[PDB]
Amino acid sequence: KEPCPPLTPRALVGKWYLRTTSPDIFKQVSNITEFYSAHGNDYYGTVTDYSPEYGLEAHRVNLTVSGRTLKFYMNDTHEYDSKYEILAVDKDYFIFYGHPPAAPSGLALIHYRQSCPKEDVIKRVKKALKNVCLDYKYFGNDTSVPCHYV
Ligand SMILES: *[C@@H]1O[C@H](CO)[C@@H](O)[C@H](O)[C@H]1NC(C)=O
Ligand SMILES: *[C@@H]1O[C@H](CO)[C@@H](O)[C@H](O)[C@H]1NC(C)=O
Ligand SMILES: *[C@@H]1O[C@H](CO)[C@@H](O)[C@H](O)[C@H]1NC(C)=O
C-alpha cells in the first residue's frame, strides 16, 4: 500500500538493523545491519546481510539526500536502488518507502537501533505507520534473528 507521507541533518548516523518490511523480503534475505556516516547532508555506509546464495556479505552504499527524498545506491547489487521517502524518524527507528526493482509497487522498510525491538519501540512504530496510512499487521519481520528463547 502506498502511504500518505506527512529529515534533520545526521539523523541516520550510526548502526541500524532492518528488521521489518512490507511486503516481506525476509525469505530472500536476513540479518541486515547497516552503518551510516554523515558527509554533510549525505551518508555513505556499509550494509551486511545473509543471502541464501552469497552467504554473509557486505555492500558499500551512498545516500544522496534531497529534502525528504533520498537516493540509495549500492555497489554490487542494484535491486534496492531507488528514491526513498522518509515516512518517520526517531531516536530508535526510521521508516522509509521507495519502489526498487525488487519491489516495484512499493517497499516500506523499518530500521531500528535495537537488534530485537521491544514493546516500547513497537508501540511507537505502529502509531507512526498509522499516521501515514500504513498498518503494522501487513508487515513481515526477520524471523531468522533470535529475539526470544525456545
Ligand atoms: C549476522 O550479522 C552479523 C553482522 O552484523 C554477523 O556478525 C553474524 O555473523 C551474522 N549472523 C548470521 C547467522 O548470519
Ligand atoms: C561491494 O562493497 C563492499 C564493501 O566495500 C565489498 O566488501 C564488496 O565485496 C563489494 N562487492 C563486490 C562484488 O565487489
Ligand atoms: C517479529 O515479530 C514478533 C512480534 O510481531 C516479535 O515478538 C519478534 O521479536 C519480531 N522479530 C524481530 C523484530 O526481530
Side-chain angles (χ1 to χ4, degrees), residues 30 40 63 93-94 109 125 147:
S30 69
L63 313 210
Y93 63 100
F94 77 88
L109 308 119
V125 161
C147 289

Side-chain angles (χ1 to χ4, degrees), residues 118-130:
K118 299 302 173 203
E119 63 176 275
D120 66 310
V121 157
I122 297 183
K123 90 199 156 209
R124 306 201 300 316
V125 161
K126 289 178 175 173
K127 289 188 271 167
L129 287 168
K130 276 301 148 55

Side-chain angles (χ1 to χ4, degrees), residues 19-20 112 115-117 122 136 141-143 145 147-148:
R19 291 304 192 231
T20 308
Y112 301 94
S115 181
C116 294
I122 297 183
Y136 191 82
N141 92 345
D142 194 349
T143 79
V145 170
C147 289
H148 303 275

Side-chain angles (χ1 to χ4, degrees), residues 7-13 37-43 65 67 86 89:
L7 176 60
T8 167
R10 287 191 146 285
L12 315 186
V13 184
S37 289
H39 191 248
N41 283 344
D42 301 319
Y43 300 92
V65 178
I86 285 149
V89 86

Side-chain angles (χ1 to χ4, degrees), residues 31 33 48 50 56:
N31 191 21
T33 304
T48 48
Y50 183 94
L56 188 36

Side-chain angles (χ1 to χ4, degrees), residues 13-111:
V13 184
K15 190 177 32 79
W16 305 94
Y17 304 89
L18 210 181
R19 291 304 192 231
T20 308
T21 77
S22 183
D24 189 13
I25 55 176
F26 297 101
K27 309 293 156 210
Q28 142 232 39
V29 76
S30 69
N31 191 21
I32 304 160
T33 304
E34 328 160 69
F35 320 71
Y36 290 129
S37 289
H39 191 248
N41 283 344
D42 301 319
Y43 300 92
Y44 58 104
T46 304
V47 183
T48 48
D49 64 85
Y50 183 94
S51 184
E53 324 178 2
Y54 307 132
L56 188 36
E57 50 170 314
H59 310 280
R60 266 162 182 232
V61 308
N62 284 116
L63 313 210
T64 305
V65 178
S66 74
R68 332 192 332 233
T69 204
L70 64 85
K71 269 146 77 208
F72 166 102
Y73 171 71
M74 260 180 167
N75 58 314
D76 54 339
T77 156
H78 305 297
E79 343 302 43
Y80 291 92
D81 290 18
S82 184
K83 299 147 78 179
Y84 288 92
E85 209 166 350
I86 285 149
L87 290 189
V89 86
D90 175 286
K91 299 210 85 176
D92 278 304
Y93 63 100
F94 77 88
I95 311 170
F96 72 18
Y97 184 72
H99 296 81
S105 307
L107 182 53
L109 308 119
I110 318 163
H111 322 239

